[PDB]
Amino acid sequence: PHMERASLIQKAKLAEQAERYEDMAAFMKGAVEKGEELSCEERNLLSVAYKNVVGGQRAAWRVLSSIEQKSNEEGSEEKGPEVREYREKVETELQGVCDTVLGLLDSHLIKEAGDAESRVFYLKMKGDYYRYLAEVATGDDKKRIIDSARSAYQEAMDISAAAMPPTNPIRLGLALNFSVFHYEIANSPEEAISLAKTTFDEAMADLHTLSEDSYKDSTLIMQLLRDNLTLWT
Amino acid sequence: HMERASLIQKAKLAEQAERYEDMAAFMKGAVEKGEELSCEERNLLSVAYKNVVGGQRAAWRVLSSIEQKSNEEKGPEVREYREKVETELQGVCDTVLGLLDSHLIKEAGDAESRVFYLKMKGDYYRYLAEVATGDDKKRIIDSARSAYQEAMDISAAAMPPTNPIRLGLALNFSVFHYEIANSPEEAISLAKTTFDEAMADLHTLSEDSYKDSTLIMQLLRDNLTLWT
Amino acid sequence: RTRRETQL
Amino acid sequence: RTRRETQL
């Protein structure tokens, strides 16, 4: 059972070259279920795979939801059922994918996480895929999901603050996604801007100290922080 | 009754959301209702499955190039995954060819739809021939040539040489000769004749028909530049 | 685009 | 551009 794991990672890399991300996610899901820890490469293969899968489902959900808003505004009555049924089917597929990711995180990855870097990576994923569920959630389920995302995000913020430099791309991307959580989901634009401001400010103070190979990843996320701040202010 | 309209409506929604596998399923259900497809519904069905099989073909070519490099010392993994993608592609082509032979080609009212459906039959047999190997390959190539030729005969007797359906048919047929049938002189001969005869009657076209004909004529001319 | 940014 | 062209 420890000779199949190498084949699953091999087929995940092949699926990535072939842009077959649903197969890639299935291959990475099987690799995680083997029980061994993931390296930095294997962590990204798992994250890249599922982000593309849920990313296309989110884009489809947003398209169908905007059409549903217009169809319940304009006066289209017979158009209503087709859009509602199809948007709900895409909504179910998206929720099913997030449950798979959150299932792998809580049952394998987050528990047996060796270093702080991986634990922040996995906890950031847990907050991300709870945030994706909150994007489509409605009532009783929604309010509990928003609390679960904040708990996962906050635990990663505390670990990264004590274990990572403010220029670390994982800490930056974590705060970037957390600020979006505050703005979009938690309805806290002042906390969203404050977190984005502080994240940019503290990373800006230490920009001259950055390492050579960290330049490209860190300055990219700082641009995203500035882009959202430009949009929110 | 009026569920057929809902299937076509959801296909348009899937197209807006770029959910082409969903779009194909909706159009498959619309065809299975038994009624004929309009010009719009003909393109919705074709666009859906062309996108679906198009990504499977691109994935197959990536895995096949990797398999060729791996055979010059790794394991079975590349072959196994390439065969799985090969199976999904064959399933999609078998579904399209199933809809054509059992619904569309039979209940074809005009020449435009009949040439369109026969061109589809040749196209998706050609996609099968791209992955076929031995015994299947020659049997599949014969089915594509027959489907292409039957569309060539109908288009020759019922369509002007500038007709975009006739042009696109000859474009894919010339590619069939070059890649699959191993007849590069017949491929070039077909592409030249199609380009020349369409060129002769370009002055008779209207503004809205001119743009569609010259678009395919450039593709014919592009392949000729590549093949000669 | 006109949308806010997030990343892996 | 480096590949041959087929229509729908």
UniProtKB/Swiss-Prot annotation, chain B:
PROSITE patterns: 1433_1, 1433_2
InterPro entries membership: 14-3-3 (IPR000308), 14-3-3_CS (IPR023409), 14-3-3_dom_sf (IPR036815), 14-3-3_domain (IPR023410), 14-3-3_sigma (IPR037435)
Organism domain of life: Eukaryota
PTM text: Ubiquitinated. Ubiquitination by RFFL induces proteasomal degradation and indirectly regulates p53/TP53 activation.
Site (Interaction with phosphoserine on interacting protein): 57, 126
Matches recorded under Gene3D superfamilies: 14-3-3 domain
Keyword annotations: Cytoplasm, Nucleus, Phosphoprotein, Secreted, Ubl conjugation
Molecular function GO terms recorded: cadherin binding; identical protein binding; phosphoserine residue binding; protein kinase binding; protein kinase C inhibitor activity; protein sequestering activity
Localization annotation: Cytoplasm; Nucleus; Secreted
Main location: cytoplasm
Cellular component aspect of the GO annotation: cytoplasm; cytosol; extracellular exosome; extracellular space; nucleus
Record-listed Phosphoserine modification sites: 6
Tissue occurrence: Present mainly in tissues enriched in stratified squamous keratinizing epithelium.
GO biological process: cAMP/PKA signal transduction; establishment of skin barrier; intrinsic apoptotic signaling pathway in response to DNA damage; keratinization; keratinocyte development; keratinocyte proliferation; negative regulation of innate immune response; negative regulation of keratinocyte proliferation
Protein family per UniProt: Belongs to the 14-3-3 family.
Subunit and partners: Homodimer. Interacts with KRT17 and SAMSN1. Found in a complex with XPO7, EIF4A1, ARHGAP1, VPS26A, VPS29 and VPS35. Interacts with GAB2. Interacts with SRPK2. Interacts with COPS6. Interacts with COP1; this interaction leads to proteasomal degradation. Interacts with the 'Thr-369' phosphorylated form of DAPK2. Interacts with PI4KB. Interacts with SLITRK1. Interacts with LRRK2; this interaction is dependent on LRRK2 phosphorylation.
Stated role: Adapter protein implicated in the regulation of a large spectrum of both general and specialized signaling pathways. Binds to a large number of partners, usually by recognition of a phosphoserine or phosphothreonine motif. Binding generally results in the modulation of the activity of the binding partner. Promotes cytosolic retention of GBP1 GTPase by binding to phosphorylated GBP1, thereby inhibiting the innate immune response. Also acts as a TP53/p53-regulated inhibitor of G2/M progression.
Name by which UniProt lists this protein: 14-3-3 protein sigma
